[PDB]
């Protein structure tokens, strides 16, 4: 699925217009991105948590340190996917 | 930041009332969960991809079956935003 498919599902679920649904989807992921870029934790009860984690440089090949925007799924999501 | 903060961002960014914004945010994450539960990837350009990955099977000898788990792979825009 893609963003436009998500938008269509949101519209169908809420009966909001596709136009409002699209603005809402874009605002959600813009907001998560911005909070992560500010180095905040994003906790979404019933879904999971986004947080930037540091990955150390590794060592012929050398990988530099990185800041990885990472996701930890909640139990509700892990359960649904596994079943 | 948490779900309530995202809802505030949605209402601020969109035409939507606070109650409609909350419905919209919940519908977004319910939709993502519904796709992953079905085993379908969710690709969001300019944010990242939600995927379903294998958990390794492991080891009277006994085998714990391989499982499916949710995963997130940040996109280039998000990674650059964080770094």
Curated annotation (Swiss-Prot), chain A:
<comment type="similarity">
    <text>Belongs to the bacterial histone-like protein family.</text>
</comment>
<keyword id="KW-0843">Virulence</keyword>
<dbReference type="InterPro" id="IPR000119">
    <property type="entry name" value="Hist_DNA-bd"/>
</dbReference>
<dbReference type="GO" id="GO:0005829">
    <property type="term" value="C:cytosol"/>
</dbReference>
<dbReference type="InterPro" id="IPR010992">
    <property type="entry name" value="IHF-like_DNA-bd_dom_sf"/>
</dbReference>
<keyword id="KW-0226">DNA condensation</keyword>
<dbReference type="InterPro" id="IPR020816">
    <property type="entry name" value="Histone-like_DNA-bd_CS"/>
</dbReference>
<dbReference type="GO" id="GO:0030527">
    <property type="term" value="F:structural constituent of chromatin"/>
</dbReference>
<protein>
    <recommendedName>
        <fullName>DNA-binding protein HU</fullName>
    </recommendedName>
</protein>
<dbReference type="GO" id="GO:0030261">
    <property type="term" value="P:chromosome condensation"/>
</dbReference>
<keyword id="KW-0238">DNA-binding</keyword>
<dbReference type="Pfam" id="PF00216">
    <property type="entry name" value="Bac_DNA_binding"/>
</dbReference>
<comment type="function">
    <text>Histone-like DNA-binding protein which is capable of wrapping DNA to stabilize it, and thus to prevent its denaturation under extreme environmental conditions. Also seems to act as a fortuitous virulence factor in delayed sequelae by binding to heparan sulfate-proteoglycans in the extracellular matrix of target organs and acting as a nidus for in situ immune complex formation.</text>
</comment>
<dbReference type="GO" id="GO:0003677">
    <property type="term" value="F:DNA binding"/>
</dbReference>
